[PDB]
Design a protein around this ligand. Sequence first.
Ligand SMILES: CCCCCCCCCC[N+](C)(C)[O-]
Ligand SMILES: CCCCCCCCCC[N+](C)(C)[O-]
Length: 707
Amino acid sequence: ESAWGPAATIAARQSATGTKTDTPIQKVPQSISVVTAEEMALHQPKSVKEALSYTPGVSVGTRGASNTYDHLIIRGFAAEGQSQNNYLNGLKLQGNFYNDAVIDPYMLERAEIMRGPVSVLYGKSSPGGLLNMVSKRPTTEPLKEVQFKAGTDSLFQTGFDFSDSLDDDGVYSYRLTGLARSANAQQKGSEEQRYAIAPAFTWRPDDKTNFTFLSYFQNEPETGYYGWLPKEGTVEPLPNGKRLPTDFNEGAKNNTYSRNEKMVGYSFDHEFNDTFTVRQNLRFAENKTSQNSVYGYGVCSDPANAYSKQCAALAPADKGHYLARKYVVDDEKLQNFSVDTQLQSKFATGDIDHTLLTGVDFMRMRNDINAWFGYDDSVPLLNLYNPSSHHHHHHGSSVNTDFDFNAKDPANSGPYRILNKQKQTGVYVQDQAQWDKVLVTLGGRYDWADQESLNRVAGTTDKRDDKQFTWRGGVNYLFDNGVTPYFSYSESFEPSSQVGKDGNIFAPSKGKQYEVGVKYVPEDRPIVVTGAVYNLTKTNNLMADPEGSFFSVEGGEIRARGVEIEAKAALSASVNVVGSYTYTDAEYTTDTTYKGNTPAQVPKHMASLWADYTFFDGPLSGLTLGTGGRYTGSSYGDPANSFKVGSYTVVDALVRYDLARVGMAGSNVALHVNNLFDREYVASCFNTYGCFWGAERQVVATATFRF
Ligand SMILES: CCCCCCCCCC[N+](C)(C)[O-]
Ligand SMILES: CCCCCCCCCC[N+](C)(C)[O-]
């Protein structure tokens, strides 16, 4: 098993996204989870976001049913500005504004999640939280796969995955992965369309050299729903005592959202001798996204719509059943270049063996944004009473009316045109010293984070250059019986793009995490079990100005302390299990407005458990039956902790059938169901006017043939 390739079992022993060197998980001083492609080929997840439902420390309902972005909250934290923090093949998919990219899970070999500070090896980053996906690479043996999907809300997907060698020595091999997917969103009127293909080529001049060209081209005409719904009609009842159906859509009938992605690069490695191996990962990408969207603001009686004329034109006891709305026309295009070069030195010192990594990381991102935002009375209002009727919870909500996205009344709306630039360069050094049953990891990195933003209207140009250092130190005790206790200290830093009263970009916020835990990776049986408790702190966060202005002030602080336990195993050639528990106690240490409050969208308790069984005997031979549940505790729906979103538990089911008994081994037919009991739940809210219905029960029929 290679950290950059398949793991023959649900549970992987090798990972390289925590130390940037192929290392067995037990030997890693930090919480690292690894979702195998096998696991994904088990729930047929719609996204990488989805594929992380059973992984501890990660919330994945920050948007409920929506899959426009794989935006995750890890250990209670996320990138500033609703930005993702996702890496692909060791290089960050730096997005900006609405320009964040997503890779389809079918093109992945494994999706990994690293909890806690990650700058010691990757540069600027939100504290406690990083996602790194590993593209599929040409396989060791021929692979000719064709897959067919069909499901709820008109889901139709056809995809292939082929990989073979051009020569008999395997010096030249390739892999072409592609898919076409179409479906209707949960919300009436909205569609999802995706076309993507991943061309990959591997060149092995010998057994010490590997150059692998990795590319991904994806076009999404319609990405789907991305609106906001009031807590009134979702979490809480509307005046008429009723609620909005989970399929309710408060967007213009003519809402449109698209994204285009193109990227080419490579993962290279060469072994010079017995102590020096060089590896370099490079990628260049140009992604675009545009949109005509009418999203919903709070209900007319929401503090938000206080200054809304349209709202202040209704009988005082009616402002609470009418929905305020706004809009945004967007069109962006960014280019992203990234290259990481590193030298791995292997040498000894007495009874101490060393694995020294030293490398430089570089990236440049440029994103040109040209959008238009509607304000308080930018768009009509929507009455919630009628769409709240039984007839709609019965026969469904109704598509609304078009909207003039062209009309840009200088009154209710305004232009937003910005040119964002970003550059980061870092040099890091780490060593993995092993003194027999003692493994000590220590390393540090220095980053040169430069940014520059041009406001094509204010004609302003805000720039800031951050020089920052972060290091991490940890130790793991290799108990020959599998258990591997460990503890470590790490740091992260995240630049601000905002500017204070002094017309200057704020200084970066930081991450300081203290963590200890134990990892059980028995060498005999194929089972992994990790457990950890930690104390993560994000210092110098932005908070409301005491003087009360339109600007924010720094110095704020938030602490996140909790416990995460996870288990993945192959308790049999017929039994498989995955489960985890998460305890997250995130709280505002220092803050003008929310001291002592817990950040929205992060539940205090989370747990999941999944198990599947396969038959090899009797008339049920080649039959797999699996099921599991995901628990999401209650959480707060706003910074003020005004109201709360209630907990919920969703059950998943699986029935797979090996198609061997028809002259087709390796091929199979399966039925996947998510939210078996079609439970109705508000996934979360980030504010009183921003709530998202969870996903309704979904059924998918899959037929994946292996030729
Ligand atoms: C596989 C581990 C399952 C553990 C589930 C624990 C549920 C804790 C619920 C917390 N509670 C709502 C009761 O406060
Ligand atoms: C997949 C694990 C299932 C855990 C379910 C835990 C439910 C706890 C309910 C406690 N309650 C909310 C009623 O106080």
